[PDB]
Amino acid sequence: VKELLEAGVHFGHERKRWNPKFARYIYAERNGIHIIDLQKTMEELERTFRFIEDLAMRGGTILFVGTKKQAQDIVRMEAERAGMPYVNQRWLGGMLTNFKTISQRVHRLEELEALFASPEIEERPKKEQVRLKHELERLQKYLSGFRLLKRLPDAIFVVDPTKEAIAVREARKLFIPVIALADTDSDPDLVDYIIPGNDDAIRSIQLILSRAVDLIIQARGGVVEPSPSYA
């Protein structure tokens, strides 16, 4: 499952826009660029996946965090493939720390599902349709992956702990383990299970996500061959 042709996909980026805590996972600066010791990536995959694999067979949910436009679509395929929740658009404040309240806003979604599946009155004003439809069209935009989540995840898995510091912040306050693919602009000490790698190139996001999705499905009852990606 592990693989070594990762250097055929990322080895890292971003110059002196670095975070000094990450130096322990950096090989050298060549291309005017911080370069990640890929060896140092394997070590942490071994330990991180052990967590994920051990987390797999226990039948426990995982929240998928990626919202930079470089990792936007690629998380949506993969979280569904493993049948687990994600956030694609905005990470709402209090998704975790205020779950019962945020998820009180999925009950409005599930309730819209039914109402627009006929009939429960269509003699409701034309303009109210206009209003309700768009609201469904609005709600749908954000919550499509969060709706699966019906309880606090036993872990969360992140693309950018720097870009999604808020997510990381809530998880911490809820003692939830934090997992993340994360490059040198990020804060290492902040993540429990670290995948020290490029977090912007779609290449790198595909390799590390999918193979982690596969490790999840492998120990969660079955296996399957390849998954969708743009070249």
Partner RNA sequence: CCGUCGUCAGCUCGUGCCGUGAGGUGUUGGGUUAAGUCCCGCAACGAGCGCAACCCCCGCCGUUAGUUGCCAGCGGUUCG
**Residue 214 binds to Mg ion (criterion: CB under 5 A):** no
Nearer of residues 31 and 129 to RNA, judged by Cβ: 129
Shortest Å distance, C-beta 20 to RNA: 22
Nearer of residues 145 and 197 to RNA, judged by Cβ: 145
What, of RNA, Mg ion, none, does residue 170 touch, CB below 5 to 8 Å by kind? RNA
Starting at the edge strand found earlier in the chain, the sheet holding 86-87 runs 86-87, 62-65, 155-158, 178-182, 193-196
Residue of minimal Cβ distance to Mg ion: 183
Nearer of residues 65 and 216 to Mg ion, judged by Cβ: 65
Residues contacting residue 152 through CB under 8 Å, at least 6 positions apart? 96, 99, 174, 176
Size of the site for Mg ion (CB under 5 A): 4
Nearer of residues 31 and 101 to RNA, judged by Cβ: 101
CA 165 to chain centre: 13
Specify which residues 34 forms β-bridges with: 29
What, of Mg ion, RNA, none, does residue 200 touch, CB below 5 to 8 Å by kind? Mg ion
Residues contacting residue 136 through CB under 8 Å, at least 6 positions apart? 109, 112, 113, 116
Nearer of residues 28 and 121 to RNA, judged by Cβ: 121
What, of Mg ion, RNA, none, does residue 183 touch, CB below 5 to 8 Å by kind? Mg ion
Residues contacting residue 59 through CB under 8 Å, at least 6 positions apart? 220
What, of Mg ion, RNA, none, does residue 6 touch, CB below 5 to 8 Å by kind? none
**Residue 199 binds to Mg ion (criterion: CB under 5 A):** yes
Tokens 């971003």 locate to: 14
At residue 48, what is the residue type?
T
**Residue 164 binds to Mg ion (criterion: CB under 5 A):** no
